[PDB]
Amino acid sequence: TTEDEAKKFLDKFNSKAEDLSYESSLASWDYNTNISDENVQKMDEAGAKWSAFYEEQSKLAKNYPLEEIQNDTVKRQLQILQQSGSPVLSEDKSKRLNSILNAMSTIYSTGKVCKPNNPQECLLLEPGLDNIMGTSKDYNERLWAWEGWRAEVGKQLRPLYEEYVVLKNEMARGYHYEDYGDYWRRDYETEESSGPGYSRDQLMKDVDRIFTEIKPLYEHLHAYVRAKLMDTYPLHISPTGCLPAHLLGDMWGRFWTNLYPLTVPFGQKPNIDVTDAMLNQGWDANRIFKEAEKFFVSVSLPKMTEGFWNKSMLTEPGDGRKVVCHPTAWDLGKGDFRIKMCTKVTMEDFLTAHHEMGHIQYDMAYASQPYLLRNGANEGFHEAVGEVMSLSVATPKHLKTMGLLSPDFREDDETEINFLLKQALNIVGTLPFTYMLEKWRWMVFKGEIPKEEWMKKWWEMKREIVGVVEPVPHDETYCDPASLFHVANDYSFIRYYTRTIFEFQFHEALCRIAQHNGPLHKCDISNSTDAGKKLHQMLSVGKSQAWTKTLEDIVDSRNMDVGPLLRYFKPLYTWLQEQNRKSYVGWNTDWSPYADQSIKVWISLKSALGEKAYEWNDNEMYLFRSSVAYAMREYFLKTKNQTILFGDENVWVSNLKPRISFNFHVTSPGNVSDIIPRPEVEGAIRMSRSRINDAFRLDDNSLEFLG
Amino acid sequence: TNLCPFGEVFNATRFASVYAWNRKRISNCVADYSVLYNSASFSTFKCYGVSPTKLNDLCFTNVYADSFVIRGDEVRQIAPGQTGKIADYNYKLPDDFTGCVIAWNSNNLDSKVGGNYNYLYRLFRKSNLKPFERDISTEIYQAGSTPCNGVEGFNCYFPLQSYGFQPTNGVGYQPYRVVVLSFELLHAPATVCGP
Ligand SMILES: [Zn+2]
């Protein structure tokens, strides 16, 4: 029968795959713990040996009909094998695609933005632009770095990205999925029985719903932050419009954590920082991880293995070892678990250590499963199991019975609101950001957004969904979404959305098992064997079950509830409402920081609509912007005796309509921040309005300027 | 009246593969089985029927010492009534086993950087093994119904795979050396007594 054929087929695949990736994991661990060029080769060799074998076994598994197989666990193993990692593409269109992906990664990693008054001080993203967008309170400086990182690097990705979705669709369609988005959303597609199956389109419907339930709590946080940012940017933020996209604490606005010094509810009271107590008490790396190991075993989980202690890299080394050390939790295989992290004696790295070991604990539980099922239920389970541990440990109660907090320390409600907000800027501020991004990409892979509408539609959803407005208008030469690491490196982004919901579902569930009374953010799972057994039962199944069921036997619901999240934030939600009584809640989609200084133009409809002889296109827009620059050039020379060399690059068109109307403003040539005031631009146009109507053959009722 | 050559079985340079497990015949010698059971070098020493304690005051016709190598997870399968890739296809013990099962971690002697792959095991067999049966055949295994005709391909696999013993593996994947003592009692001279 065709089940035995696949049962023995997987038996052999398992016997070879296990060691083929372990030698691959070893080869990449040798590199990450000692960067060299020998290790880059020893890595790529084992990676190729693994990929080639995975292709071979995905083809040989393709001709195993899933219809006639009456066992479910072996069904899922074949599914992973057939779905992923096949060839469906020609050798030329595959080579072409690989070059596009490396180019996008290299450009993002090596790109830099130079200064306006010193072009030799060019600055990379890490750590140069990261540090600016995360700490600067200078509007113009952040605007330079924001716009500069979208014109010098983003524009380079627009042609590469356009070709990248085409080859991804052409590949995804060959896997018999609708789009590349359809191929991404397959990870949530389960099979369930004793019940109805979760489908790929059901993920989109549940994600739209969850956002609409987050919109209230976000609108109030968005409104409170807006009112606070008004104190430090008085004349740049409208109290009812959107938020400038370059003032959100980083380059993109993915998190608002770096806005806490400007939005702290009660600044006079600092947030709890344990670092000084750890230092004075003489803590080291070992003490941090042993205290994390003690925490997990206090929840009836297993302690680490001496293979983890004797082989992992807990600290940056001696003797000039170049190490990529950004915290990761390696399940190399064959029961070999390690953690690579340049841990320091801080509270941040103290929580991160519990997060990493949280990944290892997940890895150890499902190690008993077959190789293809050794993974989280869906792509959001791992990084949520990681963060739930970080939640309970960061609490004042836990630090109290650790020796890092005085027993005479009090927890008043003023600091609780400080903590809740510090969490919300990170956890809740990212949810609309994460949601519109994946939505935009889903819509691009489906084809619902033509390439000539990409940036038009991209920022419409920014003002509508996230309520943030671009500081300068971007036409379709930009590729602003690709300015993010995840977009330009072909990684999913909904996994950060779903993990956040699953995180607090887990949290609210385990705090009920642990009989925790009081507010949810003060919970702690330590020393609860009841709560740890149910956790290990979910971690042990791995990927061998419907994630709906796997989630059902922890939180008692088959579905994805954002309830626990809003329940976790009710203390801040009811505080924000009382703090928003005197300001506006919501945003104005049409406002922009460049709007009032712009000038509305009305293209003449020389014939009704669609008569395309006239009815201007991209090339006429260049001629119009160059004609405006001339008028500005001529004006300053004839009225101020100044040689200011404007160009088409200094005329910014917004509110574009399909050859009907648009706005435009002007900036100083090498300084995007300084906008030429509107009355002066109006005068510069009057002086040469006869010269601009001639070139387009219009007669001053056809070409109008609304003022 | 000499001492049984257990140092040949236990202190051997290289062990045999599990599919091709070794057997040493032991006769006409004195054996102090209390050195084995009171040695701290072993991770497993389990007996069945006979008692470890002070039963080196018995007699037997022949003592049989089987030896092979497996990974830690598979040590449980060297026992009466166990199932698995080892107990079914490589080494099977009878329900009425009269002997002992000894084991010890051999990560120091059988694991190599890059990986030691000399130790093999059987992954497919048309039927299970009878107790103490050895199958050293290398016939291509037929899983489908198309004739394999002695060549591996779709639904036709080579029956023996290779243990990937690395020194950095977990304990369950680390190599373990195993010695299974078999005590035989025939209506016969009973040469190996031992005081
Ligand atoms: Zn993580």
Numbering used by the authors:
A (entry chain A): 20 to 726
B (entry chain B): 333 to 527
Please quote the authors directly:
Among the SARS-CoV-2 proteins, the spike (S) protein, which consists of an N-terminal S1 subunit and a C-terminal S2 subunit, is critical for the recognition of host cell receptors and serves as the key determinant of host specificity for CoVs. The C-terminal domain of the S1 subunit, also known as the receptor binding domain (RBD), binds to the human angiotensin-converting enzyme 2 (hACE2), the receptor for SARS-CoV and the human coronavirus NL-63 (5–9). Bats are considered as the reservoir host animals of SARS-CoV-2, and several SARS-CoV-2-related CoVs have been identified from bats. Here, we report that SARS-CoV-2 receptor binding domain (RBD) binds to bACE2-Rm with lower affinity than that to human ACE2 receptor (hACE2).
